[PDB]
């Protein structure tokens, strides 16, 4: 119809192919980034589990981009793979050239342009992956963004991608407090994943989590991926288990 | 078919992909441009949806192309990004080649050229993005405001509305604004851009963004307070209007 | 019919439907009328605006090609942006190689050669143009080995020499009138006012100096784009003339 | 002469019982004119320490380049690169331009994390692993350093004594060369502490 | 069926392609020309058609080289290409081999040129018929080039609209014009007759006739306007 | 032929460049400019081969200013000098041998201090508070450091640059026909007339 | 129109080609891996489809590196190209950047990356197979992994794929223990695979190999202590038999 | 070759000679050495003659192209910089150049840029290019003023070419001056050196080691 090429537009004056790719992101699980002035928590959901699934020796919805920017993953992992690798390469290409770590804003911009190119040119598929980017660069402090499949970006103070977006967003903005705390944000995340996800228990092995903090020294940022057994201790504290 | 590609001329001499690109513009935000005699105001509607959206780190709908040429855009933001980057790179290149700053005319003709090229081929669709390019000439004062379309046609217009429900703004802009005598002051100019946008927002001074370009490489983007002060002055003169009708009715 | 979706592609009449389709795009355009006389070629146009804010004398429909070839255009300005630049290139590179004012007839062929390309590559010329152009041109100039000439360029790569030709919406009404009123004996002043007479009739707007724009190629004056004060003077001379009639 | 000989700079590394020492001069020279006295030459990417001697332009660009590959490595594997594995990376980068090679002579120093064995290696213009566990030298005074280090060296040294051995080795050799000296710096890599100690010394 | 006419890479069950026959039709849609020849001269006589009477015709004779030249019938975009290549081969022979290129071999490279776009996807068989006349070492020749690329050495043929009436004029009188030699005027007289039978609803004008001649000591010359008013 | 000098004080970089351009055995014009500004707080004085100076300086001027516009905030001196070293590093292994040595003296706004770099034609950047290139550095590396103290004021350092001009005039056999001095601070870049 | 290119998507997301690609996997024979705390056992079967056809010319168990073997489930021919490429990239991408045989996680990604390129193009079919890749390195230990047609990979404690997937999956869940040795795994592997065909089982029809301890025997050379023999080992037909007698 | 150019208030005088020399053989004593870029820009030939002839006509084709494209007159700055890029691309390939592009425009005033093949573009007010550039500066400076009459300015270029032509071996032939105004150059003819030199002797009292 007007799915038939990616380089043709519908008489409505939308593009069905892109819209369709946007629906691709609602067959994968929730990912939540909340920015606080005292840190960013990055949270991700594992949409597949089994009792023989090894998932306790692996990170796969948390990928470090350089030493100061990391992303959370929602969507197809095959789609994700190619763009994460490219992003890591460009961000650190900036490091070589300019002898400073890449600003958060430029690297998202670079990557959103490449997405638009796959729709604009050739007969390639658009990519149905929504990444929440969390970084630190001196020129605007903590910085949070997230990217659409279309190939554009918007800033946020909190955002949710993945499945059941509409509900999840509702829940976040009800319970947000403008100053926030890094600890209160983690707690908020878990509260939200618990409700959108049908895994009622919401166990450690179903959660990936990363916190970006400047608490390690000053002027120096430490990105710490939470490891499984640690994820289990903070569910007791919030009472979920 | 016959709308299935750009390489189909169609049995009516219309390129459907150019037509559908046009329809695309409407979905983006409203934008209005108004020239004075010592300014251009380049104004845009600023979208809101949530108060968890930043405005701190997030692009505006206005982007400085160089330092004396500016651009506002309407359409898909995703599409527009690539448009804006190319427009900028060329504007810097212009001084690589000649050692002059860019002309306003040179630039708009180029950005339509880039889409026209895309339109011409069949492999690639053109962008669904219309821009207003505002600026002043290299050494001179003479305000310049220009329009581009996805077809790759460019024009000059004294004043112009593009984006969501362009026509309904347009008619109002037409009536109040004149070709014969454009706004005296930069101040008066800005408020006219505010009247136009007021309509399309509903309520707001927080979903209205104002920027000014003036000659001599002067670009300033006006603070939010000053926009709030102006939406309130427009409501104050508007109240004077309601009453003035009541008085006129009593007299006669 | 249904054979028109490719970049060639016949057609039981034996025509290229794609090529033909682009002809009807020209009727979309704004009327453009030219009248050759042995004193010069007068190129007039119609300018259409969608609102009076559109700055009428900022849009291009008459353009300078070199210093002695001018063109008027009707159709898409998108398709004309590439087409015109080619013709400019051509004329400037001809002066480079030979120190000669390009011939009207050869300049026409030059335009029309780019035009021929409709493929995505093919034997003979290499084609990159993925669709017909959707703009015809009137090419007017003066060489000194064949005088003042008027050509009509088509985006079909057919070029006809003409003595008076109109295209766009008002094409049909203009062409009938020009059939009953051509002479070899027209002065440049009769030619100018003939363009305005015909132009009002095939207009469906109101005629002013901003919905009109005349120009000439005469060797002495070179290519001269007229002023609006100048163009108004002729409009005034128009009203005076019908009184007598 | 050789562009490597023109700009100058020395790098010398050593082995001990669970320690390695790696030291350099601070001299930057462009011909006989001394440019700088306080530019270091040893860098590090992770806990693997790299020196680079030779032409200055390739010494800074190859610092940037190996940093660049190791930071990709780190992210991918989710662990810091080892010296053993970094010694191969070093040869591979150098071999990639044979007929327009980088004029440098790298020295690799570290101690493995997987075994804790002390590790060092030497390189050359177009590069190969040149293995020892004695010492590696490079630079314009490389010929002075090669004999000078050997007399002083004994195996199974403590980290604090290994310092004495390298310091002595570098300073006197540096002094008796025109395009080296001019201040120094030494890193002693224990295991998990690195002490960085700048040599007070006579200027050249 | 004819669902097969949309690709030139697809054959029919009747052992055809549809696009190549359609390209044949395209010739007929255009102007008309008659070629004929003698042993010491070759002649094309072609009708110039104009869009309207302020329009001043279309040049239907393209001079190839000073021993060869050709006329067109059908679509003009197509003709300009085929002509260009042919001229290129005549100039190549003259530079590198110091030869006037044979009419037979030149016609044969054109047949090979046609098949290049027929085989490959994209491009099309050309939609113009060409009649090439020339004078080489082996004396006068008249070749009939076709869209297909079938090349046919003939004493007289005619292509274009309602051209069957010229072949009837030429068929009756076949042996007569072979015997004419040394007199170009008389081959022109025969050609003028010929192109009369082809017309319907028209009459010959000094600017309808365009007469093209090459022979033994005469190079290729195209007569137009006031050089066709001796034989009007 | 050609001098470029640098000294950094506690709030400014003073860069200076020779007025003369000598192409051939004739001084091609006596008074000229021979510095171009990359950014509104970063200055590039240049000297080297013929007309490679100009092309390279214009190349770098476009590209640093490009990033400034996109981010909406000018690059630092650490980044800018580094960019330029990258370029030189390509250029010496490229079919086209640029032979342009430069000094990058800027004001870091985010750090709030001057930074003066010496970047060589070969492609080596080192931060240095007295650098130069050519045969400028052959006389004045010694002279500066003698009368230089860590602390200075802008008035002292200009006068110390005048001292260095004098030395250069006696014992260097090239004329410079004066020197130009632009002072780069936090308040922009300004021309200050000195001999 | 939704299902019939790699370039097209649906109003339910995804591509038709990935769903069908998954179907291709399940048409294959049953192949399985069980991870133990000191090893990984990898097993597959061979169906000769004639007594004339030899069982050894089919190689469904292939060394990628001599530390990392693989099997597949799916279409036979597709396997063969992908193994040839897997080696070819194993040496290129991380044996001239690392200069020794890749860690398990890395190669998993490189193999995964080829699958991803074979989805990425419009007009190029994705692979007919999903692999299991089991391997060893020092840093992440013994490990076992699945590379699915999409270009996506998952680490697993135990899994199975192919036709016998539903019976095998439910067996593997019940019978895995927290801690187990390799030797015990061989017996659990054998018992699971026998579900899939009965009365045609035996150590000539069953291909079984491991990535267990080094064998300095099969290293090929001696007197150099720093290097180790291959961790990968192919069990012979007589060795399968011994282990089968002991059940 | 002795070309020299100098701005004054009246315009720009471009003064050039007409003797091209191969070696011991004198190749021509009549050669035009102002290549007329378009009505408004005058270039000069020195260095490689062949290079200068072709590319300067080429700058000229680009001038017309630029004029069409913008609907405004080229800038002096724009013309030079294009020629400067062009020659920088081919550097070191048997390309050599010795041009001043001289122009007087009603938006930038009189301007001279010397362009060289090695990518030098240098702004000046006095230039001299050639083998006789050495000789040209001498006379030219000492009798120069920014306030100078048109008639005297032409006189000034007449004495400079002759003083160089006398003492240079490769220079002579004829003296070609051109004066560029806002409405473009006016050619001031060809004056044979021979004849002209003697008149200048009587009036000025110069050339005393020449007895006639």
Q: What is the DSSP string of H108-148?
A: TEEEEEEE-TTS-EEEESEEEEESSHHHHHHHHHHT--SS-
Instruction: Look up the CATH number of the domain holding residue D165.
Output: 3.60.20.10
Out of H1, H2, H44, H105, pick the active-site residue. H1
Query: How many CB pairs below 8 A link B and C?
Result: 99
Closest CA to B42 of B62, B67, B69, B66: B62
CA nearest to G103, candidates G134, G140, G147: G140
Q: How far apart are CA H201 and CA A119, in angstroms?
A: 80
CB B8 within 8 A of CB C4: yes
Find, among D125, D139, D146, the residue nearest to D180 by Cα: D139
Cβ distance A78 to G14 less than 8 Å, yes or no, reads no
Burial of H115 (0-12, 13-18, 19+ CB in 10 A): buried
Q: Could you give the number of structural domains in chain D? A: 1
Query: Is residue G174 less than 8 Å (CB to CB) from chain D?
Result: no
A51 touches chain G (CB under 8 A): yes
* Strand-strand pairing, C62-64 and G141-147: unpaired
Taking CB atoms and an 8 Å limit, are F85 and D39 in contact across chains? no
Do the Cβ atoms of C148 and C142 come closer than 8 Å?
yes
G111 touches G83 (CB < 8 A): no
Which of G142, B57, F32, F50 has the alpha carbon at shortest distance from A133?
B57
CA C38: distance to chain centroid?
A: 18
Edge-to-edge order in the sheet of strand A69-75: A62-64, A69-75, A129-137, A141-147, A153-155
What's the CA dihedral at B83, B89, B94, B99 to 10 degrees?
Answer: 150
Where do the DSSP E strands lie in B102-239?
Answer: 129-136, 143-148, 154-156, 159-162, 208-214, 218-221
CA pair distance F1, F5, nearest whole angstrom: 13
- Find the radius of gyration of the CA atoms of chain H: 17
- The two tokens of residue D154 are 């004994």
Is the CB of residue B234 less than 8 Å away from at least one CB of chain A? no
Instruction: Indicate if the alpha-carbon torsion angle G183, G185, G186, G191 is positive or negative.
Output: positive
Residue A222 phi/psi, 5-degree rounding, is -125, 120
Angle at D129 between CA D124 and CA D135, to 5 degrees: 80
Sign of torsion over alpha carbons D66, D71, D76, D77: positive
Number of domains in chain H: 1
Task: Cite the beta strand spans of G78-231 per DSSP E.
Answer: 129-137, 141-147, 153-155, 158-161, 206-211
Q: CA-CA distance, B16 to B151, in Å (whole number)? A: 10
**Calpha distance B24→B19 (Å, rounded):** 9
User: CB–CB of H141/H126 below 8 Å?
Assistant: yes
Distance CA H21, CA G21 (A): 80
Rg of chain E (C-alpha set): 18
In Å, how far is H202's CA from the nearest CA of chain F?
A: 31
Q: Give residue for tokens 């044969």.
A: E108
Closest CA to C156 of C117, C103, C123: C117
Rounded CA-CA distance G4/H54 in Å is 60
Test D67 with A96 for CB contact under 8 angstroms: yes
CA distances from residue D165 to D26, D131, D149, D190 in whole angstroms, order as listed? 19, 20, 8, 15
String of DSSP letters for E50-105: -SSSSB-----EE--SSSEEEEEEE-HHHHHHHHHHHHHHHHHHHHHH--PPPHHH
Total Cβ atoms within 10 A of residue F90: 12
CA distance D107 to D160: 21
In angstroms, the CA D73 to CA A67 distance is 12
- Report whether D13 contacts D135 (CB < 8 A): yes
b/e sequence B184-221, b meaning 16+ C-beta within 10 Å? eebeebbbbbbbbbbebbeebbebbbbbbbbbeeebee
d(CA E135, CA E151): 17
Q: Closest to B77 (Cβ–Cβ): which among A5, A117, A152? A: A152
Closest-CA residue to A165 (of A2, A6, A45): A45
Question: Considering only CA atoms, which of B121, G82, E175, G237 is closest in space to residue C118?
Answer: B121
Q: What angle do CA H16, H21, H27 make, to 5 degrees?
A: 105
- How far apart (Å, rounded) are the C-alpha atoms in residues D148 and D170? 9
* Cα–Cα distance for residue pair C50/G237, rounded to 1 Å: 87
Task: Return the closest-CA partner of residue H20 out of H48, H43, H40, H42.
Answer: H48
Which of H66, H78, H123 should we substitute to test contact with B (largest number of B Cβ atoms within 10 Å)?
H78
Write down the residue that tokens 């400073």 correspond to: A100
The alpha carbon of residue D44 and the mean position of all alpha carbons in its chain are separated, in whole angstroms, by 10
End-to-end CA distance of chain A: 50
d(CA H99, CA H54): 12
Q: DSSP assignment of C106-150, as one string?
A: HHHHHHHHHHH--SSS-SSS-----S---EEEEEEEEETTTEEEE
- Tell whether the torsion through CA atoms of H204, H206, H211 and H212 is positive or negative: negative
Q: Does H61 contact C92 at a Cβ distance shorter than 8 Å?
A: yes
Return d(Cα H140, Cα H126) in angstroms, integer. Answer: 9
- Report whether H49 belongs to an annotated binding site: yes
CB D180 within 8 Å of CB D28? no
Give the list of residues 6+ apart from residue B243 with CB closer than 8 angstroms, or none: none
Window 164-183 of F: residues touching H by CB (8 A cutoff) are none
- Rounded to whole angstroms, the Cα distance separating H79 from F121 reads 30
Q: Helix count (H) and strand count (E) of chain E?
A: 6, 10
What is the phi/psi pair of residue C224, to 5°?
-125, 120
Q: Are B183 and B7 in contact (CB under 8 A)?
A: no
* G219 in Cβ contact with G228 (< 8 Å): yes
Q: How far is Cα F116 from Cα G109, in angstroms, rounded to an integer? A: 46
Nearest C-alpha neighbor of D89 from the set D127, D139, D43: D127
Token pair recorded at residue D120: 């060092």
**Residue H123 lies in domain:** 1-212
Range of D157's domain? Answer: 1-204
Q: What is the total residue count of chain G?
A: 247
Q: Evaluate the omega torsion of the peptide bond into residue D139 and state whether it is cis, within 30 degrees of 0.
A: no
Both structure tokens of A63? 């990928």
Q: How far apart are CA E97 and CA D66, in angstroms?
A: 62
Distance separating alpha carbons of residues A58 and A60, to the nearest angstrom: 6
Burial code of F11-36, b = ≥16 C-beta within 10 A, e = fewer? ebbbbbbbbbbbbeeeebbeebebbe
Quote the CA–CA distance of A46 and A203 in Å, as a whole number. 11
The position carrying tokens 């801690």 is: G179
Question: Is the CB of A100 less than 8 angstroms away from the CB of F79?
Answer: yes
Cα Rg of chain G, angstroms = 18
- How many Cα atoms sit within 13 Å of G97 on the Cβ side? 17
Query: B64 vs F69: CB contact, 8 Å cut-off?
Result: yes
Tell me which chain C residues have a C-beta less than 8 angstroms from the C-beta of E77: 19, 115-116, 156-158
Contact assessment for residue C43 and residue C196, using Cβ atoms and an 8 Å cutoff: no
- What is the helix (H) or strand (E) element at residue B108, kind and residue range? helix B104-120
Task: Name the 3-class secondary structure at F65.
Answer: helix
Shortest distance, CA F20 to any CA of chain H (angstroms): 11
- The answer to whether the CB of B40 falls within 8 A of the CB of B144 is yes
Q: Closest residue of D to A88, CA-based?
A: D72
Q: Is G11 exposed, middle or buried (0-12, 13-18, 19+ CB in 10 A)?
A: exposed
Q: Is B207 in contact with B46 (CB distance < 8 Å)?
A: yes
How many Å apart are CA E125 and CA C10, to the nearest integer? Answer: 10
Extended strands (E) in chain B: 31-35, 40-45, 62-64, 69-75, 129-136, 143-148, 154-156, 159-162, 208-214, 218-221
DSSP bridge partners of G161? G31
The H or E element containing residue H16 is strand H11-16
Contact C65 H61 (CB under 8 A): no
Greatest pairwise CA separation for chain E in angstroms: 55
Name every residue whose Cβ is closer than 8 Å to that of residue G93 and which is 6 or more positions away in sequence.
Answer: G110
Q: What's the Cα-to-Cα distance from G7 to each of A14, A116, A158, B128, G18, rounded to whole Å? A: 18, 15, 33, 21, 11
CA distance H206 to H155: 14
Residue A175 CA: distances (Å) to CA of A145, A186, B118: 20, 13, 47
Maximum alpha-carbon separation in chain B:
69
Which residues face E145 on adjacent strands? E130
- Distance (Å) from the alpha carbon of A109 to chain B's nearest alpha carbon: 9
Sheet holding H99-105, edge to edge: H36-38, H41-42, H99-105, H109-115, H121-124
Burial class (CB in 10 A: 0-12, 13-18, 19+), B47: middle
Residue F194 burial (C-beta neighbours within 10 Å; 0-12, 13-18, 19+)? middle
Chain C residues inside the 8 Å CB shell of H68:
64-66, 88, 92
Q: What single-letter DSSP state applies at residue F75?
A: P
Helix then strand then coil, in percent of chain H rounded to 5, is 35, 30, 35
**Tally: H helices and E strands in chain G:** 6, 10
Cα H155 to Cα H158: distance, rounded to the nearest angstrom: 5
Q: Both tokens of residue B59?
A: 């692009």
E59 and E72 in contact (C-beta within 8 Å)? no
Name the helix (H) or strand (E) containing B228.
Answer: helix B224-251
Rg of chain D over all Cα atoms, to the nearest angstrom: 16
Residues near C98 by beta carbon (within 8 Å), at least 6 away in sequence: none
Instruction: Note which residues in 14-43 of chain F have CB less than 8 A from chain H.
Output: 21, 23-26, 28-29, 32
The enclosing H or E element of E211 equals strand E209-215
Resolution (A): 4.5
H44 is catalytic: no
Distance (Å) of CA G95 to CA D107, G82, G85, G220: 21, 19, 15, 20
State how far the alpha carbon of A48 is from the alpha carbons of A194, A195, E77, G178, H72, in Å: 15, 17, 62, 21, 67
Of E41, E32, E33, E34, the closest CA to residue E177 belongs to E41
Q: Is A23 helix (H, G, I), strand (E, B) or coil?
A: helix
**Cβ atoms of residues D9 and D25 within 8 Å:** yes
Chains A and C touch (3+ CB pairs under 8 A): no
Classified as helix, coil or strand, D38 is coil
Instruction: Please state, in angstroms and rounded to a whole number, the distance separating the CA atoms of residues E44 and E195.
Output: 10
* E142 to C11, E63, E68, E190, E221: CA distances (angstroms): 30, 15, 10, 15, 16
The whole-angstrom separation of Cα E26 and Cα E110 is: 18
Whole-angstrom distance, CA of residue F194 vs CA of residue F178: 8
- CATH number of the domain within which H15 lies: 3.60.20.10
H or E stretch covering F113: strand F113-119
3-state SS class at A164: coil
D68: its two tokens: 């660049």
Close Cβ partners of F124 (under 8 Å, ≥ 6 residues apart): D28, D56, D57, D59, D60, F85
Optimal mutation site among D66, D75, D76, D77, interface A, most CBs of chain A within 10 A: D75
User: For residue G71, is the peptide bond before it cis, meaning its omega torsion is within 30 degrees of 0?
Assistant: no
Bridge partners of residue D113, in order along the sequence: none
Q: How was this structure determined?
A: cryo-EM
Whether the CB of F55 is below 8 Å from some CB of chain H: the reply is yes
Helix or strand or coil: residue H79? helix
Residues 6+ apart with CB under 8 A from G220: none
């Amino acid at each position: 119809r007007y799915d038939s090429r990616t380089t043709i537009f519908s008489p409505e004056g939308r593009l069905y192919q892109v819209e369709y790719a946007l629906e691709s992101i609602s067959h994968a699980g929730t990912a939540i980034g909340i920015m606080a002035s005292d840190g960013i928590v990055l949270a991700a959901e594992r949409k597949v589990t089994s009792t023989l699934l090894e998932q306790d020796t692996s990170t796969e919805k948390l990928y470090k981009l350089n030493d100061k920017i990391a992303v959370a993953v929602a969507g197809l992992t095959a789609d994700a793979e190619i763009l994460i690798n490219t992003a890591r390469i460009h961000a650190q290409n900036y490091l070589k050239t300019y002898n400073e770590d890449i600003p958060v804003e430029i690297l998202v911009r670079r990557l959103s342009d490449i997405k638009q190119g796959y729709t604009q040119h050739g007969g390639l598929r658009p990519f149905g992956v929504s990444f929440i980017y969390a970084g630190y660069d001196d020129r605007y402090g903590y910085q949070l963004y997230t990217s659409n499949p279309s190939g554009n970006y918007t800033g946020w103070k909190a955002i949710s991608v993945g499945a059941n977006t509409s509900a999840a967003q509702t829940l976040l903005q009800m319970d947000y407090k403008d100053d926030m705390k890094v600890d209160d944000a983690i707690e908020l995340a878990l509260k939200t994943l618990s409700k959108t996800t049908d895994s009622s228990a919401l166990t450690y092995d179903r959660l990936e989590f990363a916190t970006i903090r400047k608490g390690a020294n000053d002027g120096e940022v430490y990105q710490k991926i939470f490891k499984p057994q640690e994820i289990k201790d903070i569910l007791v504290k919030t009472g979920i288990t | 078919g016959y709308d299935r590609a750009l390489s189909i001329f169609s049995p009516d001499g219309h390129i459907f992909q150019v037509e559908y690109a046009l329809e695309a513009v409407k979905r983006g935000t409203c934008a209005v441009g108004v020239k004075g005699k010592n300014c251009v105001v380049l104004g845009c509607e600023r979208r809101s949806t949530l108060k968890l959206q930043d405005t701190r780190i997030t692009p505006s709908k206005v982007s400085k192309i160089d330092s004396h040429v500016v651009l506002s855009f309407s359409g898909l933001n995703a599409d527009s990004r690539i448009l804006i980057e190319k427009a900028r790179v060329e504007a810097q290149s212009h001084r690589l080649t000649l050692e002059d700053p860019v002309t306003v005319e040179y630039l708009t003709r180029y950005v339509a050229g880039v889409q026209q090229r895309y339109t011409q081929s069949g492999g690639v669709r053109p962008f669904g993005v219309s821009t207003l390019i505002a600026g002043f000439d290299p050494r001179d004062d003479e305000p310049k405001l220009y329009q581009t379309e996805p077809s790759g046609i460019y024009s000059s217009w004294s004043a112009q509305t593009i984006g969501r429900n362009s026509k309904t703004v347009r008619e109002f802009l037409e009536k109040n604004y004149d070709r014969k005598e454009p706004p005296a002051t930069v101040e008066e100019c800005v408020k006219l851009t505010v009247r136009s946008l007021l309509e399309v927002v509903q309520t707001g001074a927080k979903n209205i963004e104002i920027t000014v370009v003036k000659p001599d490489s002067d670009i300033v983007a006006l603070s939010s307070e000053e926009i709030n002060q102006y939406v309130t002055q427009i409501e104050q003169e508007k109240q004077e209007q309601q009453e003035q009708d009541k008085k006129k009715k009593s007299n006669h | 019919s249904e054979y028109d979706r490719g970049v060639s592609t016949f057609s039981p009449e034996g025509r290229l439907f794609q090529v033909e389709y682009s002809l009807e795009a020209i009727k979309l355009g704004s009327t453009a009328i030219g009248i050759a006389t042995k004193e010069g070629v007068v190129l007039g146009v119609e300018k259409r605006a969608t609102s009076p804010l559109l700055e009428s004398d900022s849009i291009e429909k008459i353009v300078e090609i070199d210093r002695h070839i001018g063109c008027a255009m009707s159709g898409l300005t998108a398709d004309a942006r590439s087409m015109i630049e080619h013709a400019r290139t051509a004329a400037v590179t001809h002066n480079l190689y030979y120190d000669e004012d390009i011939n009207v007839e050869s300049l026409t062929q030059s335009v029309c050669d780019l035009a021929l390309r409709f493929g995505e590559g093919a034997s003979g010329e290499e084609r990159l143009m993925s669709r017909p152009f959707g703009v015809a041109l009137l090419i007017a100039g003066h060489d000194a080995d064949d005088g003042y000439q008027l050509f009509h360029a088509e985006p079909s790569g057919t070029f006809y020499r003409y003595n008076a030709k109109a295209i766009g919406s008002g094409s049909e009404g203009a062409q009938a009138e020009l059939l009953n009123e051509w002479h070899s004996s027209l002065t440049l002043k009769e030619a100018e006012l003939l363009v305005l007479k015909i132009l009002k009739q095939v207009m469906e707007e109101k005629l002013d100096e901003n919905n009109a724009q005349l120009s000439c190629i005469t060797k002495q004056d070179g290519f001269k784009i007229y002023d609006n004060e100048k163009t108004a003077e002729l409009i005034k001379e128009l009203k005076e003339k019908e009184a007598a009639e | 002469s050789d562009p490597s000989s023109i700009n100058g700079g020395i790098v010398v590394a050593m082995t001990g019982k669970d320690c390695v020492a790696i030291a350099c001069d601070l001299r930057l020279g462009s011909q006989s004119l001394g440019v700088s006295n306080k530019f270091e030459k040893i860098f590090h990417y992770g806990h693997v320490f790299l020196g680079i001697t030779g032409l200055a332009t390739d010494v800074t660009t190859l610092n940037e380049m190996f940093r660049y590959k190791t930071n990709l490595y780190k992210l991918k594997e989710e662990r810091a690169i080892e010296p053993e594995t970094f010694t191969q990376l070093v040869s591979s980068s150098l071999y990639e331009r044979r007929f327009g090679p980088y004029f440098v002579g790298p020295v690799v120093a570290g101690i493995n994390s997987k075994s804790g064995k002390p590790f060092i290696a030497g390189f050359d213009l177009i590069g190969c692993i040149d293995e020892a566990k004695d010492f590696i030298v490079s630079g314009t005074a490389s010929d002075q350093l090669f004999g000078m280090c050997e007399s002083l060296y004994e195996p199974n040294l403590e980290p604090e004594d290994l310092f004495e051995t390298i310091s002595q080795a570098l300073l006197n050799a540096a002094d008796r060369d025109a395009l080296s000296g001019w201040g120094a710096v030494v890193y002693i890599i224990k295991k998990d502490e690195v002490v960085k100690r700048y040599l007070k010394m006579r200027q050249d | 069926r004819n669902n097969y006419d949309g690709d030139t890479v697809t054959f029919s069950p009747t052992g055809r392609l549809f696009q190549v026959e359609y390209a044949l039709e395209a010739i007929k849609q255009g102007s008309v020309t008659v070629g004929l020849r003698s042993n010491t001269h070759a002649v094309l006589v072609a009708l110039k058609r104009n869009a309207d009477e302020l329009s001043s015709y279309q040049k239907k004779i393209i001079k190839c080289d000073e021993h060869m030249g050709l006329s067109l019938a059908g679509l003009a975009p197509d003709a300009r290409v085929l002509s260009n290549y042919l001229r290129q081969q005549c100039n190549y022979s003259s530079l590198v081999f110091n030869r006037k290129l044979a009419v037979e071999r030149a016609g044969h490279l054109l047949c090979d040129k046609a098949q290049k776009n027929t085989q490959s996807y994209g491009g099309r068989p050309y939609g113009v018929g060409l009649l090439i006349i020339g004078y080489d070492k082996s004396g006068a020749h008249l070749l009939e080039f076709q869209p297909s690329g079938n090349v046919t050495e003939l004493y007289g043929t005619a292509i274009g609209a309602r051209s069957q009436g010229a072949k009837t004029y030429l068929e009756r009188t076949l042996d007569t014009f072979i015997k004419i030699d040394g007199n170009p005027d008389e081959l022109i007289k025969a050609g003028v007759e010929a192109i009369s039978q082809s017309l319907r609803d028209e009459s010959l004008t000094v600017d309808n006739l365009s007469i093209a001649i090459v022979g033994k000591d005469t190079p290729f010359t195209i007569y137009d306007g006031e050089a066709v008013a001796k034989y009007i | 032929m050609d001098i470029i000098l640098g000294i950094r004080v506690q709030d400014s970089v003073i860069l200076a460049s020779s007025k003369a351009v000598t192409r051939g055995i004739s001084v091609l014009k006596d008074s000229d400019d021979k510095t171009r500004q990359l950014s509104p707080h970063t200055l590039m004085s240049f000297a080297g081969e013929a007309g490679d100076t100009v092309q390279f300086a214009e190349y770098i001027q476009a590209n640093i200013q490009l990033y400034s516009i996109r981010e909406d905030y000018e690059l630092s001196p650490q980044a800018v000098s580094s960019f330029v070293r990258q370029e030189l590093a390509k250029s010496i292994r490229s079919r086209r041998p640029y032979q342009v040595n430069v000094l990058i003296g800027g004001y870091d706004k985010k750090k709030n201090k001057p930074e003066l770099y010496q970047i060589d034609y070969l492609g080596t950047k080192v931060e240095l508070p007295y650098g130069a290139h050519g045969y400028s550095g052959f006389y004045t590396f010694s002279l500066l450091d003698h009368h230089y103290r860590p602390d200075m004021t802008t008035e002292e350092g200009l006068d110390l640059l005048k001292l260095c001009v004098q030395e250069l005039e006696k014992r260097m056999p090239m004329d410079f026909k004066g020197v130009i001095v632009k002072i780069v601070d936090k308040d922009g870049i300004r021309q200050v007339d000195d001999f | 129109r939704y299902s019939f290119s790699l370039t097209t998507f649906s109003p339910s997301g995804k591509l038709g080609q990935i769903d069908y690609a998954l179907t291709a996997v399940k048409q294959g024979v049953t192949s399985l891996g069980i991870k133990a705390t000191n090893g990984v056992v990898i097993a597959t079967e061979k169906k000769s489809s004639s007594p004339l056809a030899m069982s050894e010319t089919l190689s469904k168990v292939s060394l990628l590196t001599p530390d990392i073997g693989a099997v597949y489930s799916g279409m036979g021919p597709d396997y063969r190209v992908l193994v040839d490429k897997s080696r070819k990239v194993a040496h290129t991408s991380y044996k001239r950047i690392y200069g020794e045989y890749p860690p398990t996680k890395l190669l998993v990604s490189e193999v995964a990356k080829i699958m991803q390129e074979a989805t990425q193009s419009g007009g190029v079919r994705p692979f007919g197979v999903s692999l299991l890749i089991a391997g060893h390195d020092e840093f992440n230990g013994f490990s076992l992994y699945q590379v699915d047609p999409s270009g996506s990979y998952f680490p697993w404690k135990a899994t199975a794929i192919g036709k016998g997937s539903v019976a095998a999956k439910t067996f593997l869940e019940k019978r895995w223990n927290d801690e187990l040795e390799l030797e015990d795994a061989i017996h659990i592997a054998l018992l699971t695979l026998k579900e899939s065909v009965e009365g045609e089982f035996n150590g000539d029809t069953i291909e079984l190999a491991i990535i267990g301890d080094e064998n300095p025997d099969l290293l090929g050379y001696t007197g150099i202590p720093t290097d180790k023999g291959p961790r990968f080992r192919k069990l012979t037909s007589q060795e399968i038999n011994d282990r089968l007698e002991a059940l | 070759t002795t070309t020299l150019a100098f701005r004054f208030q009246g315009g720009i005088i471009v003064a050039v000679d007409s003797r091209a020399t191969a070696g011991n053989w004198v190749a021509s004593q009549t050669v035009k050495k102002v290549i007329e870029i378009n009505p408004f820009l005058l270039g000069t030939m020195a260095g490689g003659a062949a290079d200068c002839q072709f590319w300067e006509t080429w700058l000229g084709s680009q001038c017309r192209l630029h004029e069409l494209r913008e609907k405004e007159r080229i800038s002096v700055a724009a013309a030079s910089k294009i020629l400067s890029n062009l020659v920088y691309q081919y550097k070191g390939a048997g390309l050599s150049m010795g041009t001043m592009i001289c122009g007087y425009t009603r938006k930038e005033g009189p301007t001279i840029y010397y362009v060289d093949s090695d990518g030098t573009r240098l702004k000046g007010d006095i230039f001299c290019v050639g083998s006789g550039q050495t000789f040209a500066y001498g006379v030219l400076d000492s009798n120069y003023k920014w306030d100078l009459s048109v008639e005297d300015a032409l006189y000034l270029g007449k004495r400079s070419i002759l003083a160089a032509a006398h003492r240079d071996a490769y220079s002579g032939g004829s003296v070609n001056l051109y004066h560029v105004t806002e409405d473009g150059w006016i050619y001031h003819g060809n004056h044979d050196v021979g004849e002209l030199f003697w008149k200048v002797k009587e009036e000025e009292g110069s050339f005393n080691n020449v007895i006639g």
